Design a protein around this ligand. Structure first.
Ligand code: HEM
Ligand code: HEM
Ligand code: HEM
Ligand code: HEM
Ligand code: HEM
Lengths: 306, 304, 306, 305, 306, 306
């Protein structure tokens, strides 16, 4: 039971493609889904081993009923919108997800071209984001991003679907959200004030202790224990993007999870707040402009089509 | 006389910023100009030595007259539109060029942000391009790009203004064009046909021999010799850019010379053709959508 | 759980293939070297980690196995079989032992080779010695990316490693080697599109030709075999270009591993003898086999207990 | 059960930190143990992938009883002095071990500063050693060091506690000894004589054939078989260190095994000898000045405090 | 065209600083080493190329010059001039010989250090041994980027190497070393804004503060000196973090190279004595000098020819 | 003003030496190649930048120079002088053109050598072809670090490049080639100390032996030469291991550049003929020269105007 490259080595370029399937285009999409792995190799092999090109393919809830006629994954539903008192997490269209990652952008682009070449006439692009990491694993806010991601075996258990849905083991659920930042408001804050928003030191990336960590900080609200006192983790690979001329500076959120319920819980706590926290302070500097949910099947599920 | 980093080592990433100066923004621009060099140091230093972060700052003909007074660079003028029978080389506004290049896209972005943060309210963005190179130094047409660029002392003599304009020694002229490719039409040709368009082999990057190479191939037309039989040369740093969603696949042309004469002859010879050739066949798969000319002064000129 | 030899090696840029016959009397010398080869590998390799990626796969032939070991024989161990095709011939040349030596540098290969041969002076006669170099973009002598469609991960393990079919020799594998000599003059007279029709993949971009344009007699068409069930049968290749410019000798060293030699043997049959659909493999019109040998490569454990 | 980073990729720098816990500093220490992995991530994450930063936390027999009640690991005991006819392996105080590794020494120091930062006023430092490895993987004596360390699965089985002590599976036993070399004496030997001392060729690092190898060579005396007939292996990460001014040229021995018996048996043969060998010839040029034993638990054990 | 020592090193990440005093009788031994020092560098360095970047700069003190060499003395060679500031002292401490060893890794420094000190045993007494390490993003012990404003290329050469104005010692340089111990506790007590105003640069972005926003008792302000004509007097520095986490030692090792010592000295006067506008350099409230020494580092030609 | 060939190449770990004689009537083809040798260098090399470090040094023999160009001859150009010593012999062998191809990868060397020879077939005859690799620690086949005392920077330019003494040929160099075969068996019967006394340096640490212990017939002793003015005379070497374990060939490929071949020949004489205090060079008791040629390597622009 072989998963896709969900658990990728640290990459520094990425392309996010989000497309909707035009009416009639179902067959063309199916043809591509079976070749996506072959196209990964076709492009990636001659740059190996330093390219680390990998494409993760996601399918939406509505798209699934169009493409496959059999069983559905148990967790697959449309992205749930969140009307918070102050902050709103929108749901935007998107039937397919192409999460492409590499050491260099051209490998991402090359593969992105191939995929879209096939899909021409069959799909409509909704979003396309060229991401780049800030050489010290920092995001647009200037804080280190991905410190707390699970690794090794914790990663496998947190992300890959298992025996709880045996027909779809090796799969994962992906949530994507495009955030825009108000760098103006943000850089108008003191470095200590920023630390209260995130819940970690800016330079040293040391976590604030519980004596000091405010309850409405990002790390406070995304820290979640389950019904059995153990931590619920997601796998994130946030990527900066933007455009100096247009004044756009963004974080592209993408979180993988064994079940959508984990990442949905965190999302609620951020947007709807909790007992002590009205919302995640990060949201006063971050507007989500997109929001979608995808199932990323096992690699052989895609292979065993055409 | 210290030049800007016009002779950069090979970089895999780049940003091209073109801006106009808003009316009454001249003073803000002058302050920035005497700082570029030190922002370059600030941003790029802690990513050394692998960073290779360099910005090159250009000034358009009109912007020069608003910014400075007195003697002007001999060959500084706005880009000369070319109206050929088939193809056109368009001129588009642009007062300042920022040619930012690093081994990493994020160093470019960090430096662009600083520069732009200090020009805010004083300039209008005209063009912004985020450029990457293919792993094998190929462009969007799949051919190796930059092989016949000059190196070392040959480049220095070809790009740097010297004694023919002593007041502006250490400077250079940069011509920029944004080109979009009709990839669909390109891939319609066979390899051999495509080779007769460029004038070099695709795979091996070997120049076609003279008794094969069309008079209308790109390499045939952009090879110009002067009256003493010397090769007239420029320094190119073509970067591919694109958006897969919008089917936009382009090459961002930038050429550096000691005088626009050189670049401009090549341009004429490409768009308007010669006695043998109607036009450069590469233009049959490439539309120029921007065109601008800048003077890239000596570094010590900016630090005043 | 038996530890196999480094059959599944990371990509390496350099290789030395060394093929010897055991001189009469030399048995016990060989028997001593076989048990020390794992050690020698580490000796030469360790001080150059992790860039070195030095490994040595040691293979034993059918007739030499009877000279060396009392006991059971690997199920599929036999002398390489000549194939007398209408047009093309696959010759069988003598070989008792294989040393497939792979590193990122020719020198690490040469130092291990020097050490192995140093221990075997006067026990063996050299049949073949090839210093191979991969091109920077993973391309072969014909200018095509070579290795694209190799199995990776669990696919590679299940494809190459012997298991329950022969429990005694679990973790073993089978190597078929062939030295090919190319007619580069003829090859370069073909157009790229013609060369594409010979291989079955696009030259520049290394995309498989689509099932509907792929000629029946292309390399890729004839080397794709399906199993009883319809599981595409797989081998693990590590072709290496080798050459002498002054002798005008442009070559590809073929080595392929499988769990059973019959998979490889099927493919050779189809290449050399042809099918109803294909006269023979078009790659043979530009390639001549000048050697052919077959070896079983036992698990590391097997070599250590001698 | 997720274990500690005992099986590290090769690193070129390391810091070894040995402390004892003062009276009443138990709680300060317990708070650290539960944060230590998150400190490792905090300092190490942004240096990835080059960084290869990691820290292994060991606890001694003494400190275990102060810090935890309940079950003790099966093999955890104080380091035992060996008083050979000639050579002495000393025992020296040490309750906590920090084995900190990276490609760069700054990362090590960064992490160590964090750890001790939290421990200020609770622990007394017994030893601090900044290690570096030579570029061709040679040690202070000039020989490639670490050639025959097990890798992959062999390493897993030799190093990690399993079914035999199931409440501590994923834990490990680390033995530590600070050696100071007599370089003058050593450099007086010819290459050939030095090889006779070690057991392997100096330049090529090829092992000497059993036909030739002395029985009091280092390789001879540290080669151990079991009743199973299987080789008994440990994992080492010996590190050069010193100061040219004080003429201190050393090797810092750290060895990991799934049980202390293996390490102790190797020590026994080196210091007390066999029938064939009076002692390990390496000791004629090497003096142990520290000696401590630690149990390095599974990570999730430290996390669950 | 005399060849200078490797005063202008590529960026190096490790360093050993050696300061020794020459014992009674040690002249002959020292003179021997000085004549062999450049070839010892090559003996240790060459087999580590090109990653090694191992180099050693050798310096001779004022009192030492006269014990070693009859004849001309470098123009600005004199003992370190102590500065007894109203508040802060810049101490002088003994030193006849300096060995500034830099490489990409520490082991390479140590090996050279062992070789040098080996030849010198009995002839010298060590005063100071510092093993230095730069942080991965060129930060010092105070968490600020350190090196940004160093000159490079033709600027550095003009700034550092002796020329026409002292023709016999053209290609030499003047090195000043001081060991600084930090009160990290005081420092880490300040806000990032506070710290930024002590240095005069932004902490994360390393952007210089604007001239009228930058305090006059700031470090950048006080060490910015214009000479006769309103051009910047430059020096070349390679400060190395060092320390010990047990003894709570956290230090900068300052070393500065100049064409003439007057430059470094003017900068020191301004730091310790102050100006009209400023009492003393604010960095000095977090930093205590514990050593102070001046050396002339001659051209390699000079050392070679004795 | 005059631009040389890449004589002063950085460190490369792979090389190909190609020696060819020019057939009767082949002169025209040869001249055409010479004018394009730079194009082909950029054609093979550019796509592999920056890592490839591909370079080609073309040299021409004395007898070949006469056939190829009328006009003045490099002052120092002449056929290699046979040295018929009492024990050892430095044989002269035919060679009209030398292609010294260096890169960080052998495959890049092969690709350029293919291009050069492709244009040359039917006009030249191969005399020698050697594929060189350097050990990871810069060691030669004798196990000694090789190249330690080679000059660098300015010093290397003074020693290598023809200057104003031959103004027409300013920027050229003289290259001497000798292919040596070693008696490894004999060499390995010596203790390290005995070997050390042959070379004149310590094996492991590569420290030059002190003048007290270093024999007068050691390799370093005999290849150290002072000119009539007391300055060391230097050559630039790039010795490359080569060989074949099958045929017991263990070699050193010797190439030495000098601004005048007189420097090199001085060294060859001392090696082969000896001095008062030395019968011959002890290295020769373990090394046999099988080839011997001398070529002039012109300025790059000399070849461009053909
Ligand atoms: C559509 C955008 C363009 C593309 C994709 C392109 C691509 C190429 C390629 C593949 C080559 C051959 C390899 C090499 O770089 O040496 C080349 C050569 C060259 N191009 Fe272009 N080019 C473009 C536009 C231009 C323009 C506008 C100019 C001048 C105004 C120019 C000047 C040159 C020159 C001077 C050469 C080298 C001539 C020689 O081989 O001696 N290019 N270009
Ligand atoms: C003359 C020497 C040979 C050359 C130059 C050569 C070259 C290639 C190339 C370029 C490919 C396509 C890229 C790839 O998938 O790796 C390929 C695929 C392959 N070759 Fe060969 N090959 C040679 C001999 C052989 C032989 C003798 C066999 C079998 C006995 C073989 C079996 C295969 C297989 C199984 C594939 C993959 C087929 C697939 O796409 O599923 N090759 N080879
Ligand atoms: C004085 C400090 C020490 C030094 C410098 C040292 C050095 C070496 C060297 C050079 C080797 C050969 C290369 C290798 O396989 O790693 C080696 C092997 C080994 N050493 Fe040591 N060693 C030291 C202390 C110890 C101690 C105290 C032990 C036992 C507790 C030990 C156990 C081993 C083992 C087990 C091997 C591998 C044996 C085998 O070949 O299977 N070492 N050591
Ligand atoms: C306590 C030890 C010291 C530390 C930690 C330190 C740190 C720094 C830092 C962070 C900078 C700004 C970034 C840079 O340009 O490198 C700097 C700049 C500088 N420091 Fe220091 N420094 C120290 C001592 C000294 C001393 C003793 C001198 C002079 C004798 C000196 C001269 C300079 C100069 C000249 C600059 C650059 C001036 C400019 O901005 O144009 N430093 N130092
Ligand atoms: C049999 C082939 C040869 C081998 C294996 C060899 C090896 C070496 C070695 C190991 C060194 C010392 C390390 C170094 O400085 O590079 C050396 C130095 C040198 N060799 Fe050779 N060599 C050979 C042939 C030659 C020949 C034929 C010449 C002269 C024609 C020569 C000239 C030199 C010179 C000038 C030095 C440096 C001497 C100095 O320290 O100033 N070598 N060689």
């Amino acid at each position: 039971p072989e998963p896709q490259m969900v658990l990728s080595p640290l990459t520094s370029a990425a392309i996010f493609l989000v497309v909707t399937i035009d009416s009639g285009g179902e067959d063309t999409v199916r043809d591509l889904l079976s070749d996506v792995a072959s196209l990964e190799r076709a492009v990636g092999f001659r740059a190996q081993p330093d390219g680390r090109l990998s494409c993760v393919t996601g399918i939406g809830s509505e798209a699934w009923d169009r493409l496959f006629s059999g069983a559905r994954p148990a967790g697959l539903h449309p992205f749930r919108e969140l009307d918070g008192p102050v902050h709103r997490a929108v749901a935007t269209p998107g039937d397919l997800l192409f999460h492409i990652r590499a050491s260099r952008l051209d490998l991402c682009f090359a593969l992105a071209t191939e995929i879209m070449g096939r899909l021409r006439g069959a799909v409509t692009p909704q979003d396309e984001v060229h991401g780049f990491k800030y050489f010290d694993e920092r995001d647009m806010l200037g804080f280190v991003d991905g410190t707390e991601n699970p690794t090794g075996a914790a990663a496998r258990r947190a992300v890959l679907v298992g025996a709880e849905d045996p027909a779809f083991a090796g799969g994962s659920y992906a949530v994507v959200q495009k955030y825009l930042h108000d760098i103006d408001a943000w850089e108008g804050l003191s470095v200590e004030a920023q630390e209260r928003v995130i819940g970690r030191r800016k330079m040293t990336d040391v976590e604030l202790s519980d004596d000091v960590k405010p309850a409405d900080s990002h790390v406070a609200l995304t820290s979640v224990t389950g019904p059995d006192g153990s931590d619920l983790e997601i796998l994130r690979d946030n990527m900066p993007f933007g455009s100096v001329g247009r004044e756009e500076f963004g974080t592209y959120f993408i979180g993988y999870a064994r079940t959508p319920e984990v990442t949905e819980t965190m999302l609620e706590r951020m947007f709807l707040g909790t007992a002590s926290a009205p919302h995640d302070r990060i949201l006063d500097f971050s507007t989500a402009v997109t929001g979608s949910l995808f199932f990323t099947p096992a690699a052989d599920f895609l292979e065993d089509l055409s």
